[PDB]
Amino acid sequence: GYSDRVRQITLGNSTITTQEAANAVVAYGEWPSYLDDKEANPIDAPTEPDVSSNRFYTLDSVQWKSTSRGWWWKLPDALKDMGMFGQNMYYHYLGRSGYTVHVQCNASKFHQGALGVFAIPEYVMACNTEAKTSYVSYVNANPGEKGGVFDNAYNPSAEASEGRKFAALDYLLGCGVLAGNAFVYPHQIINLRTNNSATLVLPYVNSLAIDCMAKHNNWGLVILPLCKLDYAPNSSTEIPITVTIAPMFTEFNGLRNITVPATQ
Amino acid sequence: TAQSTPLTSGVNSQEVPALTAVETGASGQAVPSDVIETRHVVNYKTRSESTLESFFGRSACVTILEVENFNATTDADRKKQFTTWAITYTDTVQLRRKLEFFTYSRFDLEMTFVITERYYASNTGHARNQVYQLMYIPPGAPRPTAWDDYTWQSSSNPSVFYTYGSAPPRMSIPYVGIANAYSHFYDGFARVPLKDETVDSGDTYYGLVTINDFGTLAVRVVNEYNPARITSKIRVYMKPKHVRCWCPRPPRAVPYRGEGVDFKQDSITPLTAVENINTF
Amino acid sequence: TAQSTPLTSGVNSQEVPALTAVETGASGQAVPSDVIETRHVVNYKTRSESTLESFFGRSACVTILEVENFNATTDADRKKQFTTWAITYTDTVQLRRKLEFFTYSRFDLEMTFVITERYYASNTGHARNQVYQLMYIPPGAPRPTAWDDYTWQSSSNPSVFYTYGSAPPRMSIPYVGIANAYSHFYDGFARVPLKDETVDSGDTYYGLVTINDFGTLAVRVVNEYNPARITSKIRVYMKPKHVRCWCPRPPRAVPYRGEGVDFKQDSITPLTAVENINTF
Amino acid sequence: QTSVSPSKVILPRGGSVLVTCSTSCDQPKLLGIETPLPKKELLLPGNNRKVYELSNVQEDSQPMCYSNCPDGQSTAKTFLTVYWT
Amino acid sequence: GLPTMLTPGSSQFLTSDDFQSPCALPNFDVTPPIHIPGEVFNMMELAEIDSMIPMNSVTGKANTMEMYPIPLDDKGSATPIFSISLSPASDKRLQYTMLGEILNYYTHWTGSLRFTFLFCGSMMATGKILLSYSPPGAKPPTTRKDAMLGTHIIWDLGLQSSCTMLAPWISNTVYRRCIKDDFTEGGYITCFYQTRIVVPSGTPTSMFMLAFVSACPDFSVRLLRDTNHIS
């Protein structure tokens, strides 16, 4: 009676239904959970925002053209201004969170294309200057909601001003590894003849037990167009990719006044 | 062992293992007994060398250190008398690439110091046999200013004294990370630049290099100045043992240009273009 | 032990063991108790030294390698700074001849490196004590171009660092053959030249030498250039242990002229002609 | 890695061209010249150096000389022209 | 105190030894471990993951994101869609895959390979594609009546949108080498339009296809060495 293509996911007061889905990837075979008492790093009383922040948040819909080359989001910081998870984050020094990334892109049965949806632990990217090394600013490394785009050309700016940003090169995947090897990460491929949604379940992955979300970006969401979009009547059409992310099993420590980072 | 191969024959049925769907995220799963007819092959071949304890079971080279020993007169000649090296695994490109397969690792480190000498000039006399100090300076202990100051006496810093001509000195350093694993890649800063700071930390370095302080290996020549200038070379080695690793990553393809994950413009082309797609 | 000798006496009967027929392929089978009268000799003599573990139980010499150490200016002087040797047992004529008794063999190999030095010139100063790198390069790892390139750092290649003046370095290499035994003699090519090729592989080498890649032993001097030119000689040794062998063959009679089974024209006459057939 | 000494050859139509192709190695596992032109061999001592004797050169040809050194497959060509009245 | 004798191989530093050593930090209370997800216990856990082959690495499309999609159309030619040797450590289009990078740390490998092919055309584009594996030692297959005689698989297009051509372990040696060697050559692989791919009106004619590579569960390596990508 049941099928693998119809899936409803509910967290808090938010619901995603999908009728042409592929199967869901639990990353590295572990469902996210709270910090156990045998591994706890801080000793303060942890805040568990039970349903106020364990819910789906819908980002901005980027448009996937025929010349679109890729997108990237840093995952505990693309939700920095989303409801109460953006208010649980900056009022606390520590924070761990599991995730349910759901990437939404659909077309007709006459379109074609592929979207490698990745989820990269410690997605450290390269700077866009050759004056200095490991050299990216804070605003350019943490865009938040809008994310960033990749590029099919590496043009390092000789200015140290405009070179403090990610040299988001698509075939080297930012960090100088080939993109055809990126399938060792937890990944799904949106193929516009088979499916229309990619669902990943991401546990908290870090060397520490719990860490500052304001400093440290745990996961990296990556969407690569493997085969470009090609619609035969209108070759320059645009189908939107909408990313909907939920925090899961969040836990925070060290309450204080609000942290407001710089914007420039 | 690895898996054997069962004696199977041909099929004609609705059970189709040759067709998968990699949109679901899982890889291929067909073993060769599925799609063809196979014999029975008892497989005694094991994967014993490919494990992480033997994949990292080599004493790699991480740096080359140079000290000298002569009658120093100027100030640049007094800075050739010792050498302080910040301990890292990124000063070469081969043990680094074997470790950037993995995001997080946990290993007790074993070092060995292979040390050579030479005469600099030809007719400036001779020299006696030499003893070399190698002092592990944790972050906070005073780094040496001159080659014979109060810092080299090492009342609490771990020092080894290698007499030249002996077997190379060896020691094991435990897991000294303050995390529960060494973050090979760290996607974050050291601090948070706040709103309306007069500090203006618009030069905070990205990523990994703002969290790693593993120490300083300061090396002097314990002798005083000989009449003949003795130039030495020291090759610090590392061998990760008791190795555990987590969260695998693709390996480094294009060359490095620093301590980060950066890549230089003139070597962004690792492949060589084939003649056409149909070239065996 | 070997066989004893039974107390037998003379016979007169139809049982005739003295007459065999070597057309059938079997050798002779008469022991001396058959054809004569023998006493009783209890034989305590054993064949313990003639077994294959003791017949190959010597550290033979397989090659002689030369490296130097001086201030290299030209390009030929930079190729004296290191030496890369393709590993084989055929560069001498005595361990080879003991192994070409047998068609196929299976043995863990144990090597030891006995190394000498000398001064080249007389009045060009002196030199410090020296450390020698010996790096085992499997087929595929990059062979060194210069003596101090990226290849010598050996993040995964097995290297040994011999300080000159110590006991000679020793190591055991396992059975690394991709067959189930080392084919001493291989009667076949590496490929099949097809009909109407435009490739024209009419220079494919015969036989053995197109299948053996055992590695490359690259040796440098880890020191920089001393004022005095130090010329070294290195004698790579092999000692087959845990030896098994199959399918015996006649031993080599005439001398060699290469890595194959070839033989030179001026030494096709191994015998010395006797005076006549009746010469004791 | 692979050297062809007669790189620039001028010779009329129909004649013979001596092509010398060797490698920079000591063990040429697989070495040969790729052309559909008739050639027997030329005698040359040495396990490395090598000469093929090409003949009946009619059109402009560019033969490829591979050599299977233990560092990949190598490539060297030669350039030859013809003459007509 | 005790009569000892020094054997050969004393006072050497072997870079692949296994000895004990004095700990320079005695009594270092190490940081207690936590359960980090995704623990790797063996490098052959990474050989069994698919990874795209740069199959379309022709002049102009190499070194960019067009290296991966293989060109297809509706013309139904007799020419091969792609053709590649079976040398997953020394071929110019396989050594940069995730399987190819691990094999360039080793020297000898055995086992069978797994080629999973994703069709990224439209929904209405139906077709059949031949996928073939020929063991070496004959003519390299160019026409369809040469690759049908090997180990092949006829794949159909539709709902289940990923085939799997398996290249079995058919070899004289127990262990092929990780170089371009003549004696341990792997095999010849082609790909033919079985019938052709048919598109209706209002549907693109020129399409693409993605090609993966992984390792079967009888795949194993030996003899660690350095690599030849980095310097």
Side-chain angles (χ1 to χ4, degrees):
Chain A
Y2 295 102
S3 177
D4 291 331
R5 291 182 182 271
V6 179
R7 184 176 294 275
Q8 176 176 357
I9 306 168
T10 298
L11 292 175
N13 57 6
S14 64
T15 301
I16 294 174
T17 63
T18 179
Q19 297 181 0
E20 291 178 353
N23 195 0
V25 173
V26 175
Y28 299 106
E30 292 184 356
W31 189 259
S33 66
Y34 291 105
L35 179 61
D36 195 359
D37 291 332
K38 295 180 182 297
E39 294 176 354
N41 194 2
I43 64 170
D44 57 354
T47 298
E48 293 176 353
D50 188 73
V51 300
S52 66
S53 296
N54 298 300
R55 66 185 294 275
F56 287 103
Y57 295 104
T58 298
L59 278 72
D60 289 331
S61 296
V62 296
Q63 298 294 320
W64 174 49
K65 297 183 288 294
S66 67
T67 63
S68 298
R69 304 297 295 165
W71 294 272
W72 62 270
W73 289 270
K74 299 293 181 69
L75 184 59
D77 204 0
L79 296 175
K80 68 179 180 180
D81 197 359
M82 293 296 174
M84 292 223 65
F85 182 76
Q87 298 295 321
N88 289 129
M89 182 177 173
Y90 292 107
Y91 281 101
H92 291 88
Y93 177 70
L94 297 175
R96 58 176 291 163
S97 178
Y99 292 95
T100 301
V101 173
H102 186 77
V103 175
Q104 295 170 173
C105 180
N106 53 5
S108 67
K109 292 181 175 66
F110 290 168
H111 293 86
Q112 65 183 178
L115 295 173
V117 176
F118 297 100
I120 293 170
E122 299 293 329
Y123 181 66
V124 177
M125 285 183 105
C127 65
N128 197 359
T129 185
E130 291 181 353
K132 296 180 186 292
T133 61
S134 295
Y135 186 71
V136 182
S137 66
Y138 188 79
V139 179
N140 294 137
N142 293 318
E145 181 180 2
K146 62 183 181 293
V149 296
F150 287 165
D151 193 0
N152 56 5
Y154 178 75
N155 290 319
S157 67
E159 293 179 354
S161 66
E162 295 302 320
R164 295 178 64 93
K165 65 180 73 174
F166 286 158
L169 186 62
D170 58 355
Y171 63 94
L172 289 177
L173 196 67
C175 62
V177 302
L178 290 173
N181 294 321
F183 288 160
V184 299
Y185 297 114
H187 67 280
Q188 290 183 178
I189 298 169
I190 295 170
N191 190 0
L192 293 175
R193 61 174 290 161
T194 299
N195 57 4
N196 59 4
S197 68
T199 299
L200 310 185
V201 175
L202 299 176
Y204 181 74
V205 172
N206 193 359
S207 64
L208 294 172
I210 192 166
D211 193 359
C212 202
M213 290 181 180
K215 295 179 182 179
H216 188 191
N217 292 321
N218 295 317
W219 290 93
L221 181 63
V222 174
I223 297 170
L224 288 172
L226 298 176
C227 295
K228 64 182 182 293
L229 182 65
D230 194 0
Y231 179 71
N234 190 359
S235 66
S236 297
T237 187
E238 295 182 355
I239 58 170
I241 296 170
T242 302
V243 178
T244 302
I245 299 167
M248 293 178 70
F249 292 95
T250 60
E251 183 175 0
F252 293 94
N253 293 114
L255 179 58
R256 65 184 189 276
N257 53 3
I258 188 168
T259 297
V260 180
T263 61
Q264 65 183 358
Chain B
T1 63
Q3 187 179 2
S4 296
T5 302
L7 179 62
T8 62
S9 66
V11 297
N12 187 358
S13 180
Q14 296 177 357
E15 292 179 352
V16 180
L19 296 172
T20 185
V22 297
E23 292 86 2
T24 61
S27 296
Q29 295 296 321
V31 296
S33 67
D34 289 331
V35 301
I36 64 168
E37 293 181 352
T38 60
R39 64 178 295 165
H40 188 195
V41 176
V42 178
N43 192 359
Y44 294 104
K45 292 177 285 188
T46 62
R47 294 179 180 177
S48 67
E49 194 172 3
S50 65
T51 59
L52 292 175
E53 184 66 27
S54 295
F55 180 72
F56 294 104
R58 298 289 185 269
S59 295
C61 182
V62 297
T63 189
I64 296 169
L65 293 175
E66 181 178 1
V67 297
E68 290 182 353
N69 189 3
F70 63 97
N71 192 0
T73 62
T74 62
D75 187 49
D77 290 331
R78 291 180 179 90
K79 291 182 180 180
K80 293 180 182 179
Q81 298 293 142
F82 65 97
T83 299
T84 63
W85 178 63
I87 294 171
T88 185
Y89 63 92
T90 61
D91 291 332
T92 59
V93 297
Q94 291 183 358
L95 184 60
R96 183 177 180 178
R97 188 177 185 272
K98 291 172 71 175
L99 287 171
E100 291 182 354
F101 281 98
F102 300 101
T103 303
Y104 301 111
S105 66
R106 184 180 178 90
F107 57 91
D108 292 333
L109 188 63
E110 183 175 2
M111 328 186 67
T112 304
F113 294 142
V114 175
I115 298 170
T116 59
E117 292 180 353
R118 67 177 175 90
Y119 291 99
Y120 181 75
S122 66
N123 57 4
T124 61
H126 291 86
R128 302 295 295 163
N129 194 0
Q130 291 182 355
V131 176
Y132 287 159
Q133 176 169 3
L134 290 85
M135 180 175 70
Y136 175 47
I137 297 170
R143 289 190 296 272
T145 62
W147 67 274
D148 58 354
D149 59 358
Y150 66 97
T151 61
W152 292 100
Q153 67 185 359
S154 178
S155 66
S156 297
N157 294 319
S159 296
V160 65
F161 289 157
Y162 172 69
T163 302
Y164 179 73
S166 295
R170 178 176 284 173
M171 65 188 76
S172 294
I173 304 299
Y175 173 70
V176 297
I178 59 173
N180 298 116
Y182 298 112
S183 296
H184 292 171
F185 287 159
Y186 182 75
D187 191 1
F189 290 173
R191 67 181 294 274
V192 175
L194 296 172
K195 183 68 179 293
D196 291 331
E197 292 181 354
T198 62
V199 176
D200 289 332
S201 66
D203 197 81
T204 301
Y205 287 165
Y206 178 74
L208 180 66
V209 72
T210 60
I211 67 168
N212 284 319
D213 290 331
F214 294 105
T216 300
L217 184 63
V219 178
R220 73 176 184 177
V221 180
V222 184
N223 293 105
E224 291 291 328
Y225 63 94
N226 289 315
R229 181 175 178 180
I230 301 298
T231 298
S232 296
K233 294 289 181 68
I234 296 169
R235 289 176 177 86
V236 174
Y237 291 157
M238 290 181 183
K239 181 174 73 176
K241 65 181 180 180
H242 300 88
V243 178
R244 294 177 66 188
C245 293
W246 291 272
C247 296
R249 295 180 67 92
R252 184 71 175 173
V254 295
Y256 297 100
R257 68 180 177 90
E259 69 273 15
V261 299
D262 295 330
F263 56 92
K264 188 175 173 66
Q265 186 178 4
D266 58 356
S267 296
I268 60 171
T269 61
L271 291 174
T272 301
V274 296
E275 182 68 27
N276 56 4
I277 192 167
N278 292 318
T279 299
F280 293 100
Chain C
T1 63
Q3 187 179 2
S4 296
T5 302
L7 179 62
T8 62
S9 66
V11 296
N12 187 358
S13 180
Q14 296 177 357
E15 292 179 352
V16 180
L19 296 172
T20 185
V22 297
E23 292 86 2
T24 61
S27 296
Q29 295 296 321
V31 296
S33 67
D34 289 331
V35 301
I36 64 168
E37 293 181 352
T38 60
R39 64 178 295 165
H40 188 195
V41 176
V42 178
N43 192 359
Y44 294 104
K45 292 177 285 188
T46 62
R47 294 179 180 177
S48 67
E49 194 172 3
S50 65
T51 59
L52 292 175
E53 184 66 27
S54 295
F55 180 72
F56 294 104
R58 298 289 185 269
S59 295
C61 182
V62 297
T63 189
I64 296 169
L65 293 175
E66 181 178 1
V67 297
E68 290 182 353
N69 189 3
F70 63 97
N71 192 0
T73 62
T74 62
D75 187 49
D77 290 331
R78 291 180 179 90
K79 291 182 180 180
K80 293 180 182 179
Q81 298 293 142
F82 65 97
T83 299
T84 63
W85 178 63
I87 294 171
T88 185
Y89 63 92
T90 61
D91 291 332
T92 59
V93 297
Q94 291 183 358
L95 184 60
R96 183 177 180 178
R97 188 177 185 272
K98 291 172 71 175
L99 287 171
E100 291 182 354
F101 281 98
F102 300 101
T103 303
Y104 301 111
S105 66
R106 184 180 178 90
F107 57 91
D108 292 333
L109 188 63
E110 183 175 2
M111 328 186 67
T112 304
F113 294 142
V114 175
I115 298 170
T116 59
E117 292 180 353
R118 67 177 175 90
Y119 291 100
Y120 181 75
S122 66
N123 57 4
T124 61
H126 291 86
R128 302 295 295 163
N129 194 0
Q130 291 182 355
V131 176
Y132 287 159
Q133 176 169 3
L134 290 85
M135 180 175 70
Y136 175 47
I137 297 170
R143 289 190 296 272
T145 62
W147 67 274
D148 58 354
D149 59 358
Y150 66 97
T151 61
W152 292 100
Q153 67 185 359
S154 178
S155 66
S156 297
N157 294 319
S159 296
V160 65
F161 289 157
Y162 172 69
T163 302
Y164 179 73
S166 295
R170 178 176 284 173
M171 65 188 76
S172 294
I173 304 299
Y175 173 70
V176 297
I178 59 173
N180 298 116
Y182 298 112
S183 296
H184 292 171
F185 287 159
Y186 182 75
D187 191 1
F189 290 173
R191 67 181 294 274
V192 175
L194 296 172
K195 183 68 179 293
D196 291 331
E197 292 181 354
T198 62
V199 176
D200 289 332
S201 66
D203 197 81
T204 301
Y205 287 165
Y206 178 74
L208 180 66
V209 72
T210 60
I211 67 168
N212 284 319
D213 290 331
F214 294 105
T216 300
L217 184 63
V219 178
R220 73 176 184 177
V221 180
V222 184
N223 293 105
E224 291 291 328
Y225 63 94
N226 289 315
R229 181 175 178 180
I230 301 298
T231 298
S232 296
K233 294 289 181 68
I234 296 169
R235 289 176 177 86
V236 174
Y237 291 157
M238 290 181 183
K239 181 174 73 176
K241 65 181 180 180
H242 300 88
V243 178
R244 294 177 66 188
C245 293
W246 291 272
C247 296
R249 295 180 67 92
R252 184 71 175 173
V254 295
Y256 297 100
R257 68 180 177 90
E259 69 273 15
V261 299
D262 295 330
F263 56 92
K264 188 175 173 66
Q265 186 178 4
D266 58 356
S267 296
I268 60 171
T269 61
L271 291 174
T272 301
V274 296
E275 182 68 27
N276 56 4
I277 192 167
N278 292 318
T279 299
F280 293 100
Chain D
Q1 296 295 321
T2 301
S3 296
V4 177
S5 178
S7 66
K8 298 292 184 182
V9 176
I10 57 170
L11 190 291
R13 184 179 295 113
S16 296
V17 175
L18 297 176
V19 177
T20 302
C21 183
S22 178
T23 188
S24 178
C25 297
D26 199 3
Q27 188 65 41
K29 292 182 180 180
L30 180 63
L31 197 155
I33 293 173
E34 295 179 354
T35 184
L37 292 174
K39 60 183 182 293
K40 182 65 70 177
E41 187 68 27
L42 189 147
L43 62 89
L44 185 61
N47 200 4
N48 193 0
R49 63 184 69 186
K50 189 182 294 183
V51 176
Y52 289 169
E53 184 180 2
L54 279 72
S55 66
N56 193 0
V57 176
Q58 297 293 321
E59 70 272 15
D60 292 331
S61 296
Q62 292 179 356
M64 181 177 175
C65 185
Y66 58 91
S67 66
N68 193 0
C69 288
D71 290 330
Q73 184 178 2
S74 297
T75 299
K77 297 183 290 294
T78 186
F79 290 161
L80 58 87
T81 62
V82 298
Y83 182 75
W84 61 271
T85 61
Chain E
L2 184 64
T4 60
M5 181 176 70
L6 297 175
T7 63
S10 68
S11 297
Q12 66 181 356
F13 170 68
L14 184 61
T15 60
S16 67
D17 59 355
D18 191 0
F19 295 111
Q20 297 178 357
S21 64
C23 183
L25 295 173
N27 309 133
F28 189 78
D29 182 74
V30 299
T31 301
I34 61 170
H35 181 71
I36 298 169
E39 183 176 0
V40 174
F41 292 106
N42 191 358
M43 290 298 292
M44 301 305 292
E45 290 183 352
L46 296 176
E48 293 181 353
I49 297 171
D50 287 332
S51 64
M52 288 185 285
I53 299 169
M55 189 64 73
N56 196 2
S57 179
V58 301
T59 301
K61 292 182 183 293
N63 291 314
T64 60
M65 286 297 293
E66 292 85 3
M67 69 178 76
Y68 302 110
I70 300 168
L72 294 176
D73 56 354
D74 59 355
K75 294 180 176 66
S77 177
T79 219
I81 295 169
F82 66 95
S83 295
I84 192 166
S85 296
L86 188 66
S87 296
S90 67
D91 188 74
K92 292 171 70 175
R93 293 177 292 173
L94 291 174
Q95 66 180 357
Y96 289 95
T97 62
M98 185 65 203
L99 181 63
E101 294 293 329
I102 298 169
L103 291 171
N104 283 135
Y105 286 101
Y106 291 98
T107 307
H108 296 166
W109 63 271
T110 188
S112 298
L113 295 179
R114 184 182 297 116
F115 290 167
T116 299
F117 289 159
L118 177 61
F119 183 75
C120 295
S122 67
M123 182 63 204
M124 293 295 173
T126 62
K128 292 183 183 293
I129 294 170
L130 181 61
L131 300 175
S132 177
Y133 173 71
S134 297
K139 183 178 179 180
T142 61
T143 61
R144 192 176 67 190
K145 293 179 179 179
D146 287 331
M148 57 174 282
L149 297 174
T151 298
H152 68 277
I153 180 168
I154 295 171
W155 171 51
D156 187 76
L157 296 175
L159 293 175
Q160 299 292 322
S161 65
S162 295
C163 184
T164 297
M165 181 181 71
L166 290 168
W169 180 255
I170 298 168
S171 180
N172 55 4
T173 62
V174 182
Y175 280 139
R176 288 187 174 95
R177 293 183 181 93
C178 291
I179 62 171
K180 182 180 182 293
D181 188 76
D182 291 329
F183 178 68
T184 62
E185 61 185 0
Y188 291 158
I189 295 167
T190 57
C191 178
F192 290 148
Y193 290 101
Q194 180 67 40
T195 64
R196 69 179 178 88
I197 302 170
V198 176
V199 296
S201 67
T203 300
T205 63
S206 66
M207 294 177 286
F208 294 103
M209 181 181 73
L210 297 175
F212 296 164
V213 59
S214 66
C216 294
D218 57 355
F219 194 84
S220 65
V221 299
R222 303 189 301 179
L223 187 59
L224 179 60
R225 63 175 175 88
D226 287 332
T227 188
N228 195 359
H229 294 285
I230 196 66
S231 66

